[PDB]
Amino acid sequence: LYFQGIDPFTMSTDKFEPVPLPEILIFPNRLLSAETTEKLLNRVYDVPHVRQVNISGEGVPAMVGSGPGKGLPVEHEGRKVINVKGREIELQLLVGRVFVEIDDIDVVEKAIEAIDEICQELLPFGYNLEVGRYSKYRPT
Amino acid sequence: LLGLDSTENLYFQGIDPFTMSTDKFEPVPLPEILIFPNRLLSAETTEKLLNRVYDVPHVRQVNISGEGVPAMVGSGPGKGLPVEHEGRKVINVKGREIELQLLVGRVFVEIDDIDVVEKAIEAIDEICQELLPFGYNLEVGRYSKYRP
């Protein structure tokens, strides 16, 4: 079937305006240490067409299921400082998500292959990569 | 040879190119509505927002991202002083007690079907108008898994 409608992810509608820049999303199978985060961000910023890299800790801590502290959250991690392309970044939490903004939809495929090669080396415990494409709600 | 170029710009109009590489990318059926508050949310506002969002029809799951907060703080010669509850806050969402450890900057609301997103985003917009007076932006996201 040859589509004849309008997709709000790729064209303006009366309710949506496409966000030009996609994300490459990294979902590691284990949280990232400060050191891993530092190496990952430095390497990813060297990939052509990467505009910015953002990170997040988890919203909800890990709960202790056995031993001392059972039933309670793990002890909160300590603050760490990393150096990304000469800028100091303070980490309050182990990193569970990475968001990589790419400067053009057309180069996503190449960018994600490059990022995949980095992750193969740095995230031996496994990970998943996704492309996110967005549209802004702008009614009327 | 203007005039005799190939016509992929017409044939593929409105399609994102990477999506045609089905050897490498698998479409994710379920979209998300994203809430981007203009300020990082307090635990109190996060709690209110999550309670209301979980009542919107067709919401499947809700995730959050944002900025961590220290569990130790100090301005003296010694080590940091520990913050009560390790700096985290307990919130109550639909009867569940949840330890929150982010100032929230992005809410990810998974919707069960692209076809119901319009009505869902209208309900979420009404919530945000009420709960986020400092302003916010809403977006929809569609995902593709890289599976080379």
Residue numbers in the entry:
A (entry chain B): -9 to 130
B (entry chain A): -18 to 129
Text of the article:
Methyl‐coenzyme M reductase (MCR) is a multi‐subunit (α2β2γ2) enzyme responsible for methane formation via its unique F430 cofactor. The genes responsible for producing MCR (mcrA, mcrB and mcrG) are typically colocated with two other highly conserved genes mcrC and mcrD. The description of the M. luminyensis McrD crystal structure contributes to our understanding of this key conserved methanogen protein typically responsible for promoting MCR activity and the production of methane, a greenhouse gas.
We present here the high‐resolution crystal structure for McrD from a human gut methanogen Methanomassiliicoccus luminyensis strain B10. The structure reveals that McrD comprises a ferredoxin‐like domain assembled into an α + β barrel‐like dimer with conformational flexibility exhibited by a functional loop.
